[PDB]
Structure 1
Amino acid sequence: TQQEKEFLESYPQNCPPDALPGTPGNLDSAQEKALAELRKLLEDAGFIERLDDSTLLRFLRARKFDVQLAKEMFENCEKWRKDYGTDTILQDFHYDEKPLIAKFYPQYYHKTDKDGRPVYFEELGAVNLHEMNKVTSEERMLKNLVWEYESVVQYRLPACSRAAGHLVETSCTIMDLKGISISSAYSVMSYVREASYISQNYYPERMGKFYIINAPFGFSTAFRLFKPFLDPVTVSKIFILGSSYQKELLKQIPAENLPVKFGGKSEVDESKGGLYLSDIGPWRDPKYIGPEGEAPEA
């Protein structure tokens, strides 16, 4: 379809050459063969959508380029999108509760990192589900999560790719644990479990960086101790920081892109809902919005 063709050639499709192997534009002979094989296998099953290089390579990387297991993971995902209504969630779901409950679990995207990734912030430590459940449900919070993911894929990543000069398939997540207790950790645990399950199985290879900040001492000490036994890919992606996280964040995010409260210089109009209701980034800049148009407002 022209439509889909126009969209694909409307932003850069190659990852930088120093990215991980098996990423778009960085494929060896074997990898290119696995991609072509997986594609025809999915075409033979009648799939017509989501068969672009970027998508299929993510499923291949998630299965170490085992073509057969990538096919099964892909087919599992399309079945979930069917049962959950994912393909129309942007039109069907309406998180009208958000101004009322945002402060009880702040979640927001704000600008980009030095690699061009959209930066996602989650103030898990402030979570108050007792107040949240007066207004909304875990089921609706997960719908809102998938809504945002669909908005990342459809509108934030293509804009971030154009603004960066190269393909951007991943986000940079900052999770603030300030205020977390054993009690509230248990209360958010079911939500976090379902969110990771959805991320790993239906959005594979979308995690580029994951910073935990204000981590309690026991949690941070454990990571510092087991850090040497981690996959070198993993140790470049996951950071568990305590109270002094600002300098580490500033190595990864330009100071003018990082919110003031986290050691940066980026400001929002605190009178108009400030950070918690904001969605600022290149996907709100006409310079970087392509034929998909501008992302909806939550």
Structure 2
Amino acid sequence: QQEKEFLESYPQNCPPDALPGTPGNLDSAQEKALAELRKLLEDAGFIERLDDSTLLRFLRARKFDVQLAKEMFENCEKWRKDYGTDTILQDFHYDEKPLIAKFYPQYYHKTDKDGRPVYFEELGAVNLHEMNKVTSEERMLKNLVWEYESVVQYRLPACSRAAGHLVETSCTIMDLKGISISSAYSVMSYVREASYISQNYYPERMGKFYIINAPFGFSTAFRLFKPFLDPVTVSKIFILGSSYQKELLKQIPAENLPVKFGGKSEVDESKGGLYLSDIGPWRDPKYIGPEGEAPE
């Protein structure tokens, strides 16, 4: 069973100081929840994505409500049916990316100090007017599921191997330099769909969320509203302004942080520059496993 060979390719435990209910750090309750949830799903169909990390994430999202989680899994597998996201890496081909990378820079670059894939999103620079000249919202969404599936089947295992421990989550950094009320309305549609996909079909994959170059007001307002969000989803959220450099450098090494954000990592501009790169442990022989290297 080669599927089995794949979960032994990389470290299976989250670090011991990781949040509760994460692989390797389970109390008895959590263990029993997992065993008898896996039962319900295995009962009558469901033979893949029944691994511990997958299920413990769903549960961690529905606060351990085996019943509710059984459904998130069911709705997820139902969406995978329809969207065709198994085999999405085969079918979909985002050929327009070199044309439109500049009008919505999204790119993964290296790892954080805990091994997470770092995900840079310069939403502030967005230009949907130009972007729609060559592509659609539904394609943009497909691409995100492509980058997500690529995160799940390639980036995370190699990050696990390079970090010495399971890595389940990513470190997102959003540059709002250039954002406007105007831009915010034009991306509203897309961000709503992307979030729905993220939260309900990729539970617990957000490990850190940095907003940088946020307007001066916004950062202040969030510190007072903080009590509304869960205390856990506040340890991940960070909201910064003009001077973001070395607050980033506290969670990402200067060797892994791109130069434009203060670090010293750099990419060869002749081969498409930062916006078209995909450097990381998942492109490193030391850490690519029995799954092969990821597509492009």
Task: Report the TM-score, using the length of structure 2 for normalisation.
Answer: 0.99
Structure 1, residues 42-83: CA drift from partner, whole Å, max 9, x if none? 011310110000000000000000000000110000000000
CA distance in 2, matches of 1:74, 1:248: 36
Number of residue-to-residue matches in the alignment: 296
Where in structure 2 are the equivalents of 1:1-298 lying within 5 Å? 2-227=1-226, 230-297=229-296
Structure 1, residues 14-38: CA drift from partner, whole Å, max 9, x if none? 0000000000000000000000011
CA distance in 1, matches of 2:31, 2:55: 11
CA distance in 1, matches of 2:76, 2:159: 25
Once the two structures are TM-superposed, the CA of residue 226 in structure 1 deviates from its matched residue by: 2.6
CA distance in 2, matches of 1:180, 1:8: 42
Structure 1, residues 251-292: CA drift from partner, whole Å, max 9, x if none? 100010000000101000012111100000000001000000
CA distance in 2, matches of 1:231, 1:295: 35
Q: Secondary structure at the match of 1:110?
A: strand
Task: Report the TM-score, using the length of structure 1 for normalisation.
Answer: 0.98
Once the two structures are TM-superposed, the CA of residue 230 in structure 1 deviates from its matched residue by: 4.7
Q: For the aligned residues, what is the CA RMSD?
A: 0.9
Once the two structures are TM-superposed, the CA of residue 233 in structure 1 deviates from its matched residue by: 1.8
CA distance in 1, matches of 2:89, 2:259: 31
Once the two structures are TM-superposed, the CA of residue 100 in structure 1 deviates from its matched residue by: 0.3
Tell me which stretches of 4 or more aligned residues in structure 1 moved more than 2 Å: 224-232
Once the two structures are TM-superposed, the CA of residue 220 in structure 1 deviates from its matched residue by: 1.3
The structure with the greater share of residues assigned to helix is 1
Once the two structures are TM-superposed, the CA of residue 10 in structure 1 deviates from its matched residue by: 0.3
Structure 1, residues 108-152: CA drift from partner, whole Å, max 9, x if none? 000000000000000000000000000000000000000000000
CA distance in 1, matches of 2:126, 2:137: 13
% identical aligned pairs: 100
CA distance in 2, matches of 1:112, 1:26: 23
Once the two structures are TM-superposed, the CA of residue 244 in structure 1 deviates from its matched residue by: 0.8
Q: Which runs of 5+ in 2 are unaligned?
A: none
CA distance in 2, matches of 1:192, 1:219: 18
**Which shifted more, 229-238 or 14-23?**
229-238
CA distance in 2, matches of 1:231, 1:73: 20
Once the two structures are TM-superposed, the CA of residue 228 in structure 1 deviates from its matched residue by: 5.5
Structure 1, residues 86-127: CA drift from partner, whole Å, max 9, x if none? 001000000000000000000000000000000000000000
CA distance in 1, matches of 2:117, 2:2: 25
Once the two structures are TM-superposed, the CA of residue 221 in structure 1 deviates from its matched residue by: 1.5
CA distance in 1, matches of 2:44, 2:184: 43
Once the two structures are TM-superposed, the CA of residue 235 in structure 1 deviates from its matched residue by: 2.3
CA distance in 2, matches of 1:73, 1:165: 30
Once the two structures are TM-superposed, the CA of residue 247 in structure 1 deviates from its matched residue by: 1.2
Q: Secondary structure at the match of 2:16?
A: coil
**Which shifted more, 51-60 or 222-231?**
222-231
Once the two structures are TM-superposed, the CA of residue 39 in structure 1 deviates from its matched residue by: 0.3
